[PDB]
Each structure stands twice: as structure tokens, then as C-alpha cells.
Amino acid sequence: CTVGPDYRTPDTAAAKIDATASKPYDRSRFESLWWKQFDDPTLNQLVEQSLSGNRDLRVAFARLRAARALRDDVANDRFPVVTSRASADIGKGQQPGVTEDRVNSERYDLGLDSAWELDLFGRIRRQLESSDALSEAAEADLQQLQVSLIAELVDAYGQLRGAQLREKIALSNLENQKESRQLTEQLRDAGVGAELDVLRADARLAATAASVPQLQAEAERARHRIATLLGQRPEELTVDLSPRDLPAITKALPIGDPGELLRRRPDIRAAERRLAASTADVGVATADLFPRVSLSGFLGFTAGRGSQIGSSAARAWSVGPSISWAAFDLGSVRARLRGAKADADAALASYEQQVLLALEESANAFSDYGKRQERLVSLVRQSEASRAAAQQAAIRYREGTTDFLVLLDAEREQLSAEDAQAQAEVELYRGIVAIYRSLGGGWQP
Amino acid sequence: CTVGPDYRTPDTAAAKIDATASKPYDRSRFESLWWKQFDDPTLNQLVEQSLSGNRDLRVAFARLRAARALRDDVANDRFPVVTSRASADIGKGQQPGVTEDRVNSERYDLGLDSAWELDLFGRIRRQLESSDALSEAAEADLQQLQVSLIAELVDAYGQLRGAQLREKIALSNLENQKESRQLTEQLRDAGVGAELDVLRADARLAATAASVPQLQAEAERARHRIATLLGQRPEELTVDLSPRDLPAITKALPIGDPGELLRRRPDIRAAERRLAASTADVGVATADLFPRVSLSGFLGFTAGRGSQIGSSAARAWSVGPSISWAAFDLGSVRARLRGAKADADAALASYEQQVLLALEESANAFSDYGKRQERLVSLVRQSEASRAAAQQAAIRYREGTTDFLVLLDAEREQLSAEDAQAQAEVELYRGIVAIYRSLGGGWQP
Amino acid sequence: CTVGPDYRTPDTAAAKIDATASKPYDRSRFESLWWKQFDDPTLNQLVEQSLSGNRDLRVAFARLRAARALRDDVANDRFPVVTSRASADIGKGQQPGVTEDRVNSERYDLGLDSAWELDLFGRIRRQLESSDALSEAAEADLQQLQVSLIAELVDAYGQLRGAQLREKIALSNLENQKESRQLTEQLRDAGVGAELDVLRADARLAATAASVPQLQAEAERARHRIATLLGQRPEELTVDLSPRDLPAITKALPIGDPGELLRRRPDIRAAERRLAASTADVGVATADLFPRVSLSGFLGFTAGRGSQIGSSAARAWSVGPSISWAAFDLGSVRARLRGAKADADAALASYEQQVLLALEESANAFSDYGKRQERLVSLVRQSEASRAAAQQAAIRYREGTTDFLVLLDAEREQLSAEDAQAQAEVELYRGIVAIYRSLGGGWQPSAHHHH
Ligand SMILES: CCCCCCCCO[C@@H]1O[C@H](CO)[C@@H](O)[C@H](O)[C@H]1O
Ligand SMILES: CCCCCCCCO[C@@H]1O[C@H](CO)[C@@H](O)[C@H](O)[C@H]1O
Ligand SMILES: CCCCCCCCO[C@@H]1O[C@H](CO)[C@@H](O)[C@H](O)[C@H]1O
Ligand SMILES: CCCCCCCCO[C@@H]1O[C@H](CO)[C@@H](O)[C@H](O)[C@H]1O
Ligand SMILES: *C(=O)CCCCCCCCCCCCCCC
Ligand SMILES: *C(=O)CCCCCCCCCCCCCCC
Ligand SMILES: *C(=O)CCCCCCCCCCCCCCC
Ligand SMILES: *C(=O)CCCCCCCCCCCCCCC
Ligand SMILES: *C(=O)CCCCCCCCCCCCCCC
Ligand code: NA
Ligand code: NI
Ligand SMILES: [Xe]
Ligand SMILES: [Xe]
Ligand SMILES: [Xe]
Ligand SMILES: [Xe]
Ligand SMILES: [Xe]
Ligand SMILES: [Xe]
Ligand SMILES: [Xe]
Ligand SMILES: [Xe]
Ligand SMILES: [Xe]
Ligand SMILES: [Xe]
Ligand SMILES: [Xe]
Ligand SMILES: [Xe]
Ligand SMILES: [Xe]
Ligand SMILES: [Xe]
Ligand SMILES: [Xe]
Ligand SMILES: [Xe]
Ligand SMILES: [Xe]
């Protein structure tokens, strides 16, 4: 007999995300190794190294091992606990009721001690049920950490490429600006220009030059995040992170059925497991409303004289059946039961919150990614127009048919447009990461 | 007697906030349902729904129940703990003292077991005092969560309106810029224009177009945050969140006496409660320096033969008065007492820190709100001048009395001014939230 | 005898930071009171007030005392625990074995009760070894908090000066802009200007005016962070924070040998101590594979009649030697051992992660600081050219040889350049803080014979 509530997984409705029945997405398959679709061998090597080197991941494997070991101890409580012991009780004094003389008093015991709770109401079955569930929670915590780590690492590689891309855009615009500064000097020196043109050109050149070490600095913080995520020291990175293009995915994104997301996400499973364990804990406490039946035992040797221990004349056995019940202390048992009920309500609510946070993450990731595609189309147009404008403004300044401010302003806009477009490409890549993170991709799924 | 210190709430001086004798503020009343002053029924519905749906709030209620359950168990220790038992000791072997033959031996007991610590030094009174205080702390944690949740939600609604406001500003500027692009093409096509004007107009149009999906993306993240704060899935959100104006409060802000803030804030009460509990815990530990006086009992039946249990010939009673005192183990008792004293100093320091954090939050909220009002006055002036400038620049460009860059730049400034003004209005709304959060507004007892 | 693994500090290689062999840095000495290099008495007073008033620091000191007190209780388990008792047993009923009559029964005891676990396999020595290490971890947590707090406070002072600097730049640019607005009005009113010029001038003035209360607002948030970090209420600040220059260090930075950073960082020591404690806990669990030997005792008086307690005829004593061993419960003991092994692997990995996070912080702080110096050189050039451009554009606008946009744009760029430069100066100062934070500056490593 196993008292208290029988846990049932909640009847959690599947995710509905309408925005996913469109062209950017392929619901017909899900790609578990979602980062491989970027077709970037360097990224793939980063991820592989991270799975064997990351120290947080190592901690989580260890915690999983700890939880199994806890469970394994609790499972032995289903059986009698048979220990060994050699003891004595030696003294001199009165023996009240028997005599008022001070007599010597000796007793020796050697053998097996047995302690056994008969699990008639399932206190122990429930403890094991809880511990098994906490083991499964720990496995899910590990899987979630893997999902989180892969996403963080892929994202950081993106940021690194972004900084590299933007540095290259900044240096390229710096050269255009150097050419222009040089033209303002030439015109001024030939008597058909102005110091005012050279000054403004210098100021703009220095502004653009100032962005370079900023961008390099962000690249270096990203390289350094990557090294830690790999379990590697900053100066000991194995993998060559020299500049390459920001990866892209041109096929529609294999996102599977978004209805499956709540079943795929390990954080959801972890919190469901904790709910199951907490529900079993109600059982544990509920069992204390009923009597506790135990059976102690001794098998070995008992004697008044040490010499006899081990011999036939000292053979002994004893059996200690016991039934106890809280009786007038039932109020206390009820208080602990209320406590366990409260903890299980906490766990339920906490599970529900994770479900909601997960649906929120996915809804954001999909809404973002679609908008980021739209935005990019406009930014690409801005860049094209800007490049063309600055080209023409350069020709006109050179020829004497437009003021320097026209060229200055067109150059500012070209840089500003090309930079924003790159940032937006990085955003798109990061949005891909957020989608897969939110779907629970990357643990074996 | 009740040993150890008698807790007294610290004499914490009232908050002094001088900036509040200004006319932005009404110290003559405080409005508990502070969000209702925005006169936004949609906001009011959100708040009411969140109080019944939010899952973090559910967790906190459950933790409150857990703490009451702990307290209820402790309270029973003021009374004797009277449990029930049926036991036996059955076996064969020597009986030291009595005989060296291996004899059969039986003993049966059935009745009530009684255990009572008498509480002469108040160890138990103090345990209960601590537990009651931790219950009040848990109630205050819940109330603080209510304050935090309401503030987060109101703030998020503000962000949502902000994104919607800014989208509308971006679309309105997009129309002006579309008209301009069209004018540059027209003038070019009519032989009094230039390709360079069309290109720059295209670039600027695309830039403005690009901002729209960004702002929509932010609107969607805010919609989704609102749904979770309500305890709802994103696609189930009941409330119509289609655009409306960012709410405003035109009367002076009813902020009450700022010297009441520390009494109103539940976080301060929670930390004060934990301090009270920790002070009682010093009492608990201090009691262990004194003797512990207890009284055990048995009432029921005892017999050498199973047959007799229940009969008057097996009636039994016993009574076990006992006094113990740590004696040579006083060093251990002292170490635990030092430990409890240390924990109480931690709690005191931690209470003081919450006081300081609260005064910091308050002082920031008031400093900010005044500055945000000032800043807005300038931004409103900037917007007006900018719109006028761009209107006139458009007239002049069309007429042939100013270059396109003059119109371009005036259009950029109009958008930049109108968007900054909107952001600043959002800031002002959020400043209102920060004031009320910091004053401890919005909780139920 | 002491059982289970004998802890050894891991053989952690020294930090390698190559970028530190260059001339921004002086590796020949380290300054532990690293903020004093700024030669700012106001900053020095803030830091001193913080060390005596900050409440987080007080919390952490208290937690350190709690952990020592826990350890002191555990230490007494190496010795017999000798308590005292006065008790009685009174009742009426059968005495199984002896009689089936219901007899009256009385008994009185007064004396010393003794309990002693003899630490033959070191279960207790190991518990103490763990507890001592957890105390050292708490000491190191406190020291790390001190490092973090000092850094936070110095950083905040920098942000405060930054806000004050930028306000001053904004007001100064506001004055230039007022002069220009006045010129647009004059030219318009004298028949050779344009309303369009006055309107754009007005818009820009309002933009610049709008920045002032924002910057003042940041100054006030900073003042308030500083007050809490000092343990002070916002309106009760002891130190005068009225505007002064952002401090600067002209000497190359005394950063010592970066290969001594992992030894100096308290967070690294804290994690190493938790590793040591965890390793000792393996010992504790390993001891349960062996027998446990105990010895109980009683010495005092026992009697059937209350009157006799205290007299020679009621003298009593007993001794309770005992040895137990898990026997068929060894699988449970093994499960606990595997558990403790798992926790020690967790702790090792956690120690290693802290090492890596520390190397990452250090490497970022040095990469940043170098880059921030370079960036500043360019921003200074931008400011100079911009100031000059705006002067010339003003001359040309006055002449009737440009539209006002030329002057407007030059003025925007001047403000934008001077503001960016100031932010970048603040960045450099904050990068100094990040270096010292990451090196473990601001606590006293050689205090307490070190260990
Ligand atoms: C008056 C004389 C009485 C004689 C009684 C027999 C003595 C018991 O002596 C016993 O001998 C064993 C080996 O033989 C040992 O293993 C036991 O531990 C020992 O105590
Ligand atoms: C208060 C915690 C630290 C004090 C350590 C010394 C013991 C203090 O114990 C004191 O002695 C008396 C006992 O009857 C009582 O009257 C006091 O109220 C009690 O607290
Ligand atoms: C009333 C009968 C009890 C016998 C005397 C009690 C001994 C109390 O003595 C205690 O021993 C502690 C640790 O060993 C010492 O540190 C304390 O100074 C002392 O309080
Ligand atoms: C683990 C050894 C027991 C140590 C108790 C030592 C108490 C002193 O702790 C000290 O406090 C200061 C701030 O409060 C820190 O700067 C010191 O570095 C720290 O050692
Ligand atoms: C809920 O109360 C269920 C109680 C179940 C008791 C189960 C006992 C199983 C042992 C079966 C052995 C049969 C003969 C073998 C003798 C050792
Ligand atoms: C759970 O208790 C519900 C009641 C119905 C289940 C029946 C199980 C019968 C068990 C009898 C146990 C007595 C054993 C005592 C040995 C010392
Ligand atoms: C100091 O001397 C304390 C004063 C209070 C009396 C102390 C004795 C125990 C009080 C517990 C209250 C309920 C006990 C009822 C017994 C059935
Ligand atoms: C391992 O088997 C332990 C052997 C137990 C023998 C008893 C030792 C008597 C105590 C010596 C005192 C030394 C003090 C050092 C304190 C760290
Ligand atoms: C310290 O002195 C080392 C003692 C040497 C060991 C012998 C003690 C016998 C007790 C039985 C322990 C069995 C361990 C089982 C593990 C697989
Ligand atoms: Na109780
Ligand atoms: Ni020390
Ligand atoms: Xe044994
Ligand atoms: Xe330029
Ligand atoms: Xe930088
Ligand atoms: Xe047994
Ligand atoms: Xe411009
Ligand atoms: Xe019972
Ligand atoms: Xe019984
Ligand atoms: Xe029994
Ligand atoms: Xe809420
Ligand atoms: Xe435009
Ligand atoms: Xe976007
Ligand atoms: Xe005593
Ligand atoms: Xe500090
Ligand atoms: Xe201006
Ligand atoms: Xe502001
Ligand atoms: Xe700050
Ligand atoms: Xe012993």
C-alpha cells in the first residue's frame, strides 16, 4: 500500500506559434545539431571542443553523479539494514529494586544488528520515487546546460565575426575618408579649396579611426568568452579565429513542429521532474499519519562473562517488533504534511512559470527573426543608395560643382549605413540562435 | 523565565527627501492603487488579472504556507508530546545479572509515551518567537513581490505604448520622407534636379523604413512580457492591446509623507522580521547554557506474557523527571551561541543595507522624475522648431532657393527630435512607476 | 590513522598575459592601495569611509564569524563529551524477567554522562579539516567582496566625474550655440538672413539644453550609489562631491607580475578552499567503510532511595565500550562515498572555472585598456579639428559665404566630439579599475602569515 497522491504529468497544451506557418520556416524537419547548418567547420570545432572542455558542463555531470548516489542510498531502505557490533556495559553500583549493595555488573554482546521499517504505507517507496525523480531532474539540468552553452557559444562566435566584419567596414570607410582628406588638402594647396574643408575632413577621419580600436576590443572580449566556454585559457586557444564571413543559412529553417518544443526543452523536463519529486514528498509526509511498523533484530552472542562470547552457551537472538503512532501529536504530523503540500504547490506553480517563460522565449525568437529579415532588406537598400550617393558626391566635389559638406555628409551616411547593415546581419544570426535555444535544440533532441 | 535578549525594532530614522516639498508632488495624500491615476482601464484590467494569474506570486503564497506549517509544528512543543506504542522484545539467550542459562524472554508494552521539555528558561518560547517572525517575513516577501510585479507590469505596458508611439512617429516621418523622395525624382525628371538628390533621399527613406520593424519587434517582446506577467500564454492574451496613447498623470503626484516609506515597504518589513527571528534564535542558543528540565511518561500496559496485555494485572505507569546540563560540554554550547550571535549581526547589517538600498531607490526616483520633467520641456521645444524648420526647408527646396541637403538634414532632425521626445515621455511614465515602487505602493494585508 | 584522500592544492599554471611587457605597464612593482595613485584625496576619503561603513562587508564578516563558530563546535568532537544529569524513574507495574506482580519502582541518578567517538580512522579529524577549510573560504569571500566593493566605488566616482565633466561641456557648447542663434536672428532682421536659420538654431539649442538634466540625473544616481557603498543615507554624505577633474595616472601602471594574479585573487582562494573542504568530505565518507569505536561512561550516584544520592553507599560508575561496522549496509556507505566523490569532482571543476573566469577578466581588462588609450588619441584629434572647424564656420557664416547648415553641422560635431572624448576619458579611468579588480587589488594578502 502506497499512500498520498499518485503523481500525474500535468496536461500541458502544446505550444501554438502561428508565425511559423510561413516561408522563412520549414516545419517538416527539425535539425538537432542546428549549428551545423551554418556550414562553418570552425564553428563546428568550437562546439565539439566545448562539449569536452567546458567546466560548467563538468559540474553538471558531477551533480548528476551526486543525485544518483543519493538515490542509491535511499533505495537500500526498502530492505533490512544489517550492521555488526561488539559491545560491553561494565560498572559497579546499586541495582534499584534488586539490591542496595554496590555490585559489579557486566554484559557483553557480539553479532548482527538489524533495523527494518516495514513499508506498509509506502513512506519509503515514496522517498525512493522522489529521489528517482530528482535524479531525472539532474539529468535534465545537464541537458539544459548543454543547450544553453551551445547557444551562448554560437552566439559569441557571431559577435566575434560581427566585430571583425565591422572593423573591416570601418577600415574601408577610413580609406575613403583618407582619400577625401587628401583631396581637400590638394584643393586647398592649389588655391581652390579651404582650410574649413580640411578641418572637417580631419575630424571625420579621426572619428572613424576611433571606432577601430573599439571594434577590436569587442573582438578580443568575444575571443576571450569563447576560450572560457571551451574550457581553455585565453592565450591557449587551439582554434584559429582569424577573420571569416559571418555565417548564413540560406535554406528555410528546419524548426520542426513547434508543438513539440515543450517536450524537447530540458528545462521544462527538469521542472516537471521536480514537481514529480515534490508530489512524492507529499506521500512521504502523508505516511506519518499512519502507524509506523518496524522490526529490529539481533543475532549473535550475549553473556555476563567476556570469556563465553563466541561459544554455544552464549548464543543469543532477539526480535523487536514495534508499532508506533503519533496519537495526540497528530497535529505536528499534519503541520509537516501542510508543509509538504505547500512545497508541491510551489513546484507546480514553478513548473507552470517555466512553461510560460519558454513560450515567451519562443514567441520572441520568432517575432524577432521575421522582423529582422524585413529590417535587413531596408538596410541593404540604404547601403546601396548611400554608396552611390557618396561616389557621386566625391566626383562633384572634385570637379568644383558641390560644397565639401555634401561629400562629408554622404560619407558619414555610407559608414553609418554599412555599419548598421552589418549589425543587423549579426542580429539575424543571433536570432537564429535564439530560435534554436528556445526550441530546446542541441542536447541529443 | 525567558532567557537571552528581548528583541526591539531598531530606531530607524524616517526617510528625509527634500526634493518632495516641490510642486510636482502632493504630500497630503498617498494613493495605494497608484496605477489607477493613469486613468487607463486597460492598464487596470492588466493589473487585476496579474494578481490572480501570476505564477511567481503563486510561489510566494505557497512559501508563506510552508512557513506557517513550520511554525505550527514548533508551537506544539509548548505541550507534552504524547504518542502511542505497541512493542515487544522476544528472544532466547543469557540474561546478564539474572542467569547464565539461555532462557526464553518476552516483554510486551502497549500504551502512551510522553515526552515534555518544561521550558523553564524559554528555549521553546524563543523557538516559537523565531518561527512566528519568519512567518511574518514570508508574508512580507509576498507583499514585496506584489509591489515588484505591479511595478514591472505597469512599466512594461509603458514600454509597449512607447514602441507603438514611436512606430507611429516613424510612419509619419516615413510619409514626409516619401513625399520628399518623390519631389527629388520630379525635379530631376523635369530637368531642375539631380540624381544625387534622389539617391540621398532613397537612403534616408530606407533608414526610416528600417526602424519600423525594429519598433514592432519591441512591441511584440513587450506584449509577450505582459502575457507572462498575467500568467498567460502569448497566443491566449485576452486583453486588447491595440495602440492607445501613453497614459499621463496631470495632477501633482500623491506621494504621501516620504517619512512613511520605510514603514510601508514590505522588503524593509521582511528584513526586520528576519532580524527579529535571528534575535530570538540567540535566545534559543542562550537557553542551552542553563539546565534542560524534562518529564517523560508511560501509561498503559507492561507484561512478561503477551496474554496479559490489556488486563488490569498488566497495568503500568512511569514518570521520568530529568535535568541535564552541558557541564564539560559548555564550550560547544558557547560555540553555537557565538554562531547565533554572528547570524544575528549578519541579519542586522542586512536589515540596515535594505534600508539604505530603499533610500537610494527613493532618492533616484525623485531626482530622475524632476530631471525628466525638465528635459521634456526642452525636447518639446526641439520638436516644434524642428517641424517648423523642415516645413520651411521643404517649401524652399521645391521653390529652388535651398539645396536638398538642407531639406535632408531638417528631416533627419525632425525625426530625431520627435523620436527623442517620445522616448522622454516614456521615461517620464517609467519614472512615475519607479517613484511608487520605491515608496512601497500597491500591496494588500 | 587518517583515511581517504590527502588534499593537495592543484598545480595551477601562472597567468600568461603577453600584452603587459609593453610601456603602459610597470611589472616591477604592485600597488595594493591601487586607487591612491590617482592622487585624489576625495577618492581616498570615500574608500576609507566605505571600509568602515559598508554593510555588505559587515554581513560577510559576520558570516565568517559564524563559520569559525561552526568549526569550533566540530573541533570539540575530538574529545569526550561530558555532560551532567540528575534524574529519576518512578512507577508501578510488572518487571519482565523478574516478577509478574505489579510492584512500585524507584530510581535516582546524579552524575556525569560521557560520550566519546574515538577517532581511529579520522572521521572527526576530516570533519574538522573540512570545517577549517570552509572558514578559510568565508575569509576569502569577504576579501573578494572587499576587492569588488573598492572597485565598484572607484568606478562610480569616475562615472560621477564623467557626468559632471559632460554637463560642463554641454553648457559650454550651449553658450556657443546661443551666440550663433543670436547671429541668425541679427542677419534675418538686417534683411540678409533667413527664418530657416533661426529655426534650426533654436532646435539645436533645445537639443543641447535637453542633455543637461539627463547628465545631472546621472550625477545624482552616481552620488546615491556612492552613499550606499559608504553605508550612508543619500542626504547624509560626509564627503563633498562638488565637481573636480576626472583623476588621472601619468606614471606607468604598477601591475606587478601578472603571473602572481591567481595567488592574489581571493575568489580563487575561496574556490580552492571549497575544493579542499570537499576533498576532506571524501575522507569523512571513506571513514564509514571502517569500524566506528565509541566509549560511553557514567560516574556519579545511583540509588533506590532519594536520601542516599551523594553518599558513599550510592557511588556508581559504568563504562560502555562499543565497536560497530556497516557490514551488510556497506552498499549505503558506498553510495555516500560515491556521492562525496562526485561533489569533489564538482568542486574541482568549479575551481578550474574560477581560474578561467579570472584569466578572462584579466585578459579583457588588459585588451580594453590598450585599445582605450588608442581610441582616446584619435578622439583628442577629432575634438581639436572640430573646435577649429566650428570657429572657421562661424567666421564664414558671418561673412555671407555659407548657409547656416555649415555652421550648424560644425557645432553639432564639436559637441559630439567633446562629449565622446570625455566619455572615452571615463572609459580609460574605468579600464584602470577593471585591471586592478582583475589583479586582486585592494585587500592585504600577507596579513595572517598569509594562511
Ligand atoms: C572453573 C573452570 C571452568 C572452565 C570453562 C572453559 C573456559 C572458556 O575460555 C574460552 O576459550 C576459547 C578457546 O578455547 C576462547 O576463544 C574464548 O574467547 C575463551 O574466553
Ligand atoms: C544573552 C546571551 C548572552 C549572555 C551569556 C551569559 C548568560 C546570560 O543569561 C542571563 O542570566 C539570568 C538567568 O536567570 C537571566 O536573568 C538573564 O535574563 C539571562 O539572559
Ligand atoms: C554541577 C556538576 C558539574 C561539574 C563541573 C562542570 C564543568 C564546567 O566547566 C566548564 O568546562 C568548560 C569546557 O571543558 C570550560 O571551558 C568552562 O570554562 C567551564 O565552564
Ligand atoms: C579563516 C581564519 C579565521 C579568520 C577570522 C579573521 C577576521 C579578519 O578578516 C579580515 O577582514 C577584513 C575586512 O573586514 C579583510 O580585508 C581581511 O583581509 C580579512 O582577513
Ligand atoms: C502494501 O501494503 C503492500 C504490502 C506488501 C508485502 C510484500 C511482501 C513480499 C515478499 C514475498 C515472499 C514470498 C515467500 C518468500 C520468503 C522469503
Ligand atoms: C493501505 O493500507 C490501504 C488498506 C488496504 C491494504 C491491505 C494490506 C494488508 C497488510 C497487513 C500488514 C500486517 C503486518 C505486521 C508485521 C509485524
Ligand atoms: C519563566 O519562568 C516562564 C513563565 C511561563 C511558565 C513556564 C512553564 C511552561 C509554560 C508552557 C505553557 C503551556 C503549558 C501547559 C501544560 C499542559
Ligand atoms: C590513528 O590511528 C590515531 C592513533 C590514536 C592514538 C592516541 C593519541 C594521543 C594524543 C596525542 C596529542 C597530539 C596533539 C596534536 C593536535 C593536532
Ligand atoms: C589505518 O590504520 C588503516 C587501517 C587498515 C585496514 C584494516 C581494518 C579492518 C576493518 C574492515 C574494513 C573493510 C573495508 C572494505 C572496502 C572495500
Ligand atoms: Na511538534
Ligand atoms: Ni586571514
Ligand atoms: Xe564489529
Ligand atoms: Xe572625410
Ligand atoms: Xe576601446
Ligand atoms: Xe538478524
Ligand atoms: Xe549636414
Ligand atoms: Xe499503536
Ligand atoms: Xe502489544
Ligand atoms: Xe507489537
Ligand atoms: Xe503581480
Ligand atoms: Xe527623404
Ligand atoms: Xe528588428
Ligand atoms: Xe545537573
Ligand atoms: Xe568596501
Ligand atoms: Xe545653434
Ligand atoms: Xe533625464
Ligand atoms: Xe553608478
Ligand atoms: Xe575502547
Residue numbers in the entry:
A (entry chain A), B (entry chain B): 1 to 445
C (entry chain C): 1 to 451
Please give the exact wording used by the authors of the publication that reports this structure:
To gain more information regarding the dynamics of the OMF tunnelling mechanism, we focused our interest on OprN, the OMF protein associated with the MexEF complex within P. aeruginosa. The protein channel is closed by a lid of three β-turns at the extracellular side and occluded by a constriction of three a-coiled-coils at the periplasmic side, which gating mechanism is probably ruled by an iris-like movement.
The OprN channel of the drug transporter MexEF-OprN was analysed in the presence of xenon by X-ray diffraction. OprN-wt and OprN-Xe structures perfectly match each other with a Cα rms deviation of 0.21 Å over 1352 atoms of the trimer, suggesting an overall protein fold unaffected by the xenon interaction. Among these peaks, 17 were identified as xenon atoms, according to their high hydrophobic environment, and one was attributed to an opportunistic nickel cation coordinated by the His-tag in subunit C. The main feature of the OprN-Xe structure is a site of xenon with 100% occupancy, named M1. This site is located on the non-crystallographic three-fold axis running along the channel at the periplasmic extremity of OprN. The xenon is trapped in sandwich between the three symmetry-related Leu 405 forming a tight hydrophobic constriction of the channel at that extremity. In addition to the M and S sites all located in the a-domain, seven additional xenon atoms are observed at the level of the β-barrel domain. Even if xenon cannot be considered as an inhibitor, it is likely to hamper in the specific case of OMF's the two proposed transport mechanisms: the iris-like mechanism on the periplasmic side, by filling this constricted key-cavity along the channel, and the overall concerted stretch/rotation mechanism by filling specific hydrophobic cavities, built by the coiled-coil long helices forming the cylindrical scaffold of the α-domain.
